[PDB]
Amino acid sequence: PLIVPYNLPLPGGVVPRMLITILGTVKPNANRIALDFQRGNDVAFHFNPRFNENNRRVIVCNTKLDNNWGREERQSVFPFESGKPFKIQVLVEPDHFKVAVNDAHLLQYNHRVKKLNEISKLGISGDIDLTSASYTMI
Protein backbone atom coordinates (compact mmCIF):
# COMPACT_ATOMS: atom_id res chain seq x y z
CA PRO A 1 0.00 0.00 0.00
CA LEU A 2 1.84 3.06 -1.38
CA ILE A 3 0.48 6.61 -1.78
CA VAL A 4 -0.29 7.88 -5.29
CA PRO A 5 1.21 10.01 -6.83
CA TYR A 6 4.40 8.15 -5.98
CA ASN A 7 7.97 9.21 -6.74
CA LEU A 8 10.55 6.46 -7.16
CA PRO A 9 14.11 7.76 -7.26
CA LEU A 10 16.38 6.07 -9.80
CA PRO A 11 19.84 6.71 -8.29
CA GLY A 12 22.37 7.70 -10.96
CA GLY A 13 19.75 7.42 -13.67
CA VAL A 14 18.76 4.48 -15.80
CA VAL A 15 21.09 2.04 -17.50
CA PRO A 16 20.57 -0.83 -19.93
CA ARG A 17 19.50 -4.07 -18.15
CA MET A 18 17.61 -2.16 -15.45
CA LEU A 19 14.15 -3.65 -14.92
CA ILE A 20 11.43 -1.66 -13.21
CA THR A 21 8.38 -3.54 -11.93
CA ILE A 22 5.13 -1.83 -10.91
CA LEU A 23 2.29 -3.80 -9.31
CA GLY A 24 -1.13 -2.34 -8.65
CA THR A 25 -4.86 -2.53 -9.30
CA VAL A 26 -6.81 -0.26 -11.61
CA LYS A 27 -9.62 1.56 -9.77
CA PRO A 28 -13.19 1.04 -10.94
CA ASN A 29 -14.23 3.67 -13.52
CA ALA A 30 -10.59 4.66 -14.09
CA ASN A 31 -9.77 7.45 -16.55
CA ARG A 32 -5.97 7.40 -16.77
CA ILE A 33 -2.66 5.93 -15.63
CA ALA A 34 0.69 7.67 -16.09
CA LEU A 35 4.31 6.67 -15.67
CA ASP A 36 6.69 9.61 -16.10
CA PHE A 37 10.44 9.05 -16.35
CA GLN A 38 11.86 12.49 -15.53
CA ARG A 39 15.12 14.28 -16.30
CA GLY A 40 14.66 17.29 -14.05
CA ASN A 41 11.58 19.13 -15.36
CA ASP A 42 11.69 17.25 -18.67
CA VAL A 43 9.77 14.01 -19.14
CA ALA A 44 11.95 11.54 -21.03
CA PHE A 45 9.16 8.96 -21.35
CA HIS A 46 5.47 9.50 -20.57
CA PHE A 47 3.54 6.22 -20.69
CA ASN A 48 -0.15 7.12 -20.52
CA PRO A 49 -3.03 4.62 -20.78
CA ARG A 50 -6.26 6.53 -21.39
CA PHE A 51 -9.49 4.64 -20.66
CA ASN A 52 -11.83 7.05 -22.44
CA GLU A 53 -10.45 9.16 -25.26
CA ASN A 54 -13.46 9.73 -27.51
CA ASN A 55 -14.94 6.45 -26.16
CA ARG A 56 -11.81 4.52 -27.16
CA ARG A 57 -9.04 3.01 -25.02
CA VAL A 58 -5.54 3.99 -26.13
CA ILE A 59 -2.01 4.16 -24.79
CA VAL A 60 -0.21 7.44 -25.49
CA CYS A 61 3.58 7.74 -25.29
CA ASN A 62 5.48 11.02 -25.50
CA THR A 63 8.38 13.17 -24.34
CA LYS A 64 8.21 16.67 -22.81
CA LEU A 65 11.14 19.02 -23.39
CA ASP A 66 11.27 22.59 -22.04
CA ASN A 67 7.54 22.35 -21.14
CA ASN A 68 6.54 21.33 -24.71
CA TRP A 69 5.13 17.90 -25.61
CA GLY A 70 6.52 16.23 -28.75
CA ARG A 71 5.02 13.92 -31.36
CA GLU A 72 2.75 11.33 -29.75
CA GLU A 73 3.18 7.62 -30.33
CA ARG A 74 -0.08 5.72 -29.92
CA GLN A 75 -0.78 2.05 -29.25
CA SER A 76 -4.32 0.63 -29.59
CA VAL A 77 -3.49 -2.68 -27.84
CA PHE A 78 -4.86 -2.04 -24.35
CA PRO A 79 -4.20 -4.74 -21.72
CA PHE A 80 -5.61 -2.84 -18.71
CA GLU A 81 -9.13 -3.25 -17.32
CA SER A 82 -10.92 -1.24 -14.66
CA GLY A 83 -11.00 -3.04 -11.33
CA LYS A 84 -8.24 -5.56 -12.19
CA PRO A 85 -4.67 -6.15 -10.92
CA PHE A 86 -1.77 -5.48 -13.26
CA LYS A 87 1.97 -5.78 -13.56
CA ILE A 88 3.92 -3.26 -15.64
CA GLN A 89 7.55 -4.03 -16.36
CA VAL A 90 9.81 -1.50 -18.02
CA LEU A 91 13.14 -2.84 -19.27
CA VAL A 92 15.73 -0.27 -20.26
CA GLU A 93 17.59 -1.38 -23.38
CA PRO A 94 20.37 0.45 -25.21
CA ASP A 95 18.08 2.11 -27.79
CA HIS A 96 14.61 1.95 -26.25
CA PHE A 97 12.42 1.40 -23.25
CA LYS A 98 10.64 -1.95 -23.57
CA VAL A 99 7.25 -2.32 -21.83
CA ALA A 100 5.46 -5.53 -20.90
CA VAL A 101 2.12 -5.75 -19.11
CA ASN A 102 1.03 -8.95 -17.33
CA ASP A 103 4.04 -10.74 -18.83
CA ALA A 104 3.17 -9.92 -22.47
CA HIS A 105 5.20 -7.54 -24.61
CA LEU A 106 3.28 -4.33 -25.29
CA LEU A 107 5.52 -1.70 -26.90
CA GLN A 108 8.94 -0.14 -27.30
CA TYR A 109 9.81 3.56 -27.16
CA ASN A 110 13.00 4.82 -28.80
CA HIS A 111 15.16 7.04 -26.57
CA ARG A 112 14.58 10.70 -27.39
CA VAL A 113 16.39 11.91 -24.27
CA LYS A 114 19.89 10.50 -24.65
CA LYS A 115 21.46 11.32 -21.28
CA LEU A 116 20.19 8.13 -19.62
CA ASN A 117 22.21 8.76 -16.46
CA GLU A 118 20.17 11.93 -15.86
CA ILE A 119 16.75 10.22 -15.94
CA SER A 120 16.72 9.98 -12.15
CA LYS A 121 13.04 9.89 -11.10
CA LEU A 122 9.93 7.89 -11.97
CA GLY A 123 6.57 9.41 -11.18
CA ILE A 124 3.58 7.11 -10.93
CA SER A 125 0.11 8.64 -10.99
CA GLY A 126 -3.50 8.09 -11.97
CA ASP A 127 -6.48 5.98 -11.07
CA ILE A 128 -4.70 3.06 -9.41
CA ASP A 129 -4.05 1.44 -6.09
CA LEU A 130 -0.30 0.99 -5.99
CA THR A 131 1.05 -2.17 -4.37
CA SER A 132 4.77 -2.17 -5.20
CA ALA A 133 7.33 -0.20 -7.24
CA SER A 134 10.88 -1.51 -7.45
CA TYR A 135 13.85 -2.08 -9.70
CA THR A 136 16.57 -4.62 -10.24
CA MET A 137 19.36 -5.45 -12.69
CA ILE A 138 18.94 -8.43 -15.00
Ligand SMILES: CO[C@@H]1O[C@H](CO)[C@H](O)[C@H](OC(=O)c2ccc(C)cc2)[C@@H]1OC(C)=O
Ligand atom coordinates in the same frame (compact mmCIF):
# COMPACT_ATOMS: atom_id res chain seq x y z
C1 LIG B 1 -2.26 16.86 -25.80
O1 LIG B 1 -2.69 16.43 -24.51
C2 LIG B 1 -1.58 16.13 -23.67
O2 LIG B 1 -0.95 14.94 -24.12
C3 LIG B 1 0.26 14.66 -23.41
C4 LIG B 1 0.94 13.47 -24.09
O3 LIG B 1 1.09 13.75 -25.49
C5 LIG B 1 -0.05 14.42 -21.93
O4 LIG B 1 -0.75 13.19 -21.73
C6 LIG B 1 -0.87 15.57 -21.34
O5 LIG B 1 -1.38 15.19 -20.06
C7 LIG B 1 -0.69 15.71 -18.88
O6 LIG B 1 0.40 16.26 -19.00
C8 LIG B 1 -1.33 15.55 -17.54
C9 LIG B 1 -0.55 15.57 -16.38
C10 LIG B 1 -1.15 15.42 -15.13
C11 LIG B 1 -2.53 15.25 -15.03
C12 LIG B 1 -3.17 15.09 -13.68
C13 LIG B 1 -3.31 15.23 -16.18
C14 LIG B 1 -2.71 15.38 -17.43
C15 LIG B 1 -2.05 15.92 -22.24
O7 LIG B 1 -3.01 14.86 -22.20
C16 LIG B 1 -4.26 15.14 -21.50
C17 LIG B 1 -5.14 14.17 -21.34
O8 LIG B 1 -4.53 16.35 -21.03
Ligand SMILES: [Cl-]
Ligand atom coordinates in the same frame (compact mmCIF):
# COMPACT_ATOMS: atom_id res chain seq x y z
CL1 LIG C 1 19.50 14.42 -23.93
